[PDB]
Amino acid sequence: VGSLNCIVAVSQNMGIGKNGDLPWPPLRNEFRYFQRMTTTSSVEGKQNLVIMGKKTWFSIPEKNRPLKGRINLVLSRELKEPPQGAHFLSRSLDDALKLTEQPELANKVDMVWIVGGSSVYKEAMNHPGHLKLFVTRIMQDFESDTFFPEIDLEKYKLLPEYPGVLSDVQEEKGIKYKFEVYEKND
Ligand SMILES: NC(=O)C1=CN([C@@H]2O[C@H](COP(=O)(O)OP(=O)(O)OC[C@H]3O[C@@H](n4cnc5c(N)ncnc54)[C@H](OP(=O)(O)O)[C@@H]3O)[C@@H](O)[C@H]2O)C=CC1
Numbered sequence: 112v113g114s115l116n117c118i119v120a121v122s123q124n125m126g127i128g129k130n131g132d133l134p135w136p137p138l139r140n141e142f143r144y145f146q147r148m149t150t151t152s153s154v155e156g157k158q159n160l161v162i163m164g165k166k167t168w169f170s171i172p173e174k175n176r177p178l179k180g181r182i183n184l185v186l187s188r189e190l191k192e193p194p195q196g197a198h199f200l201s202r203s204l205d206d207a208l209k210l211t212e213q214p215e216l217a218n219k220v221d222m223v224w225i226v227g228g229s230s231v232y233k234e235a236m237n238h239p240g241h242l243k244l245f246v247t248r249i250m251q252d253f254e255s256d257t258f259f260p261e262i263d264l265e266k267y268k269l270l271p272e273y274p275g276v277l278s279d280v281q282e283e284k285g286i287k288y289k290f291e292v293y294e295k296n297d
């Protein structure tokens with residue numbers, strides 16, 4: 112209905128995951144920021160939809176599943192029904208966005224958030240239209256097995272600031288990271 116956005120936390124070597132989990136120790140305010148951005152709707156009586164791939168879903172502790180206050184959609188071609196806790200299942204990202212325009216959800220969803228994995232990001236990314244990427248830069252290297260695709264600076268502009276997103280360097284468990292927002296329209 113509203114805006115299509117991606118949200119990712121990536122290490123300096125572009126890593127987003129390792130053996131089913133994050134490559135760094137848990138960062139509690141990085142998690143807090145993920146939840147405040149995905150859960151806040153810009154219009155009353157609306158909710159945000161969060162789209163993820165099957166291993167992203169299973170990477171979330173079972174006790175926080177489904178993500179609360181959000182419409183949880185799982186992307187999968189192998190699954191027959193949404194996994195336990197999930198609200199929706201689609202076989203592709205267009206089917207997922209085609210569903211948004213179904214009276215079902217059409218008067219219900221403000222913003223649409225893509226939360227992972229790389230294949231989903233790679234795809235939302237080349238998709239046409241207005242897109243924003245919310246990138247948390249974890250400023251160090253971490254052994255990964257899964258990476259974020261390359262941001263094309265000829266298409267995405269790094270914004271100088273964005274309301275509700277801290278512009279300075281954060282630090283936790285001794286890891287420094289900073290929050291960035293990029294925008295596209297093509
Ligand atoms: N740090 C961060 O910001 C993030 C970290 N992570 C971490 O990264 C990893 C998850 O990674 P990734 O491996 O990339 O996993 P995904 O979560 O993207 O899983 C891939 C599965 O999802 C389904 N799928 C994905 N894209 C599509 C599509 N376009 N159409 C239909 N089905 C699709 C397929 O399921 P099937 O095989 O069933 O068809 C595919 O096997 C974990 O390590 C997780 O903890 C994850 C996201 C964000």
Ligand SMILES: CN(Cc1coc2nc(N)nc(N)c12)c1ccc(C(=O)N[C@@H](CCC(=O)O)C(=O)O)cc1
Nearest residue numbers: 118119120142143145146170171175178179226247
């Ligand atoms: C592997 N993922 C992806 C993920 C982790 O961190 C991120 N950070 C950003 N910026 N982007 C992402 N896409 C993620 C996730 C794992 C677990 C939860 C999770 O438990 N979320 C609770 C967190 C609540 C809390 O931590 O207190 C929630 O309500 O969102 C979310 C995402």
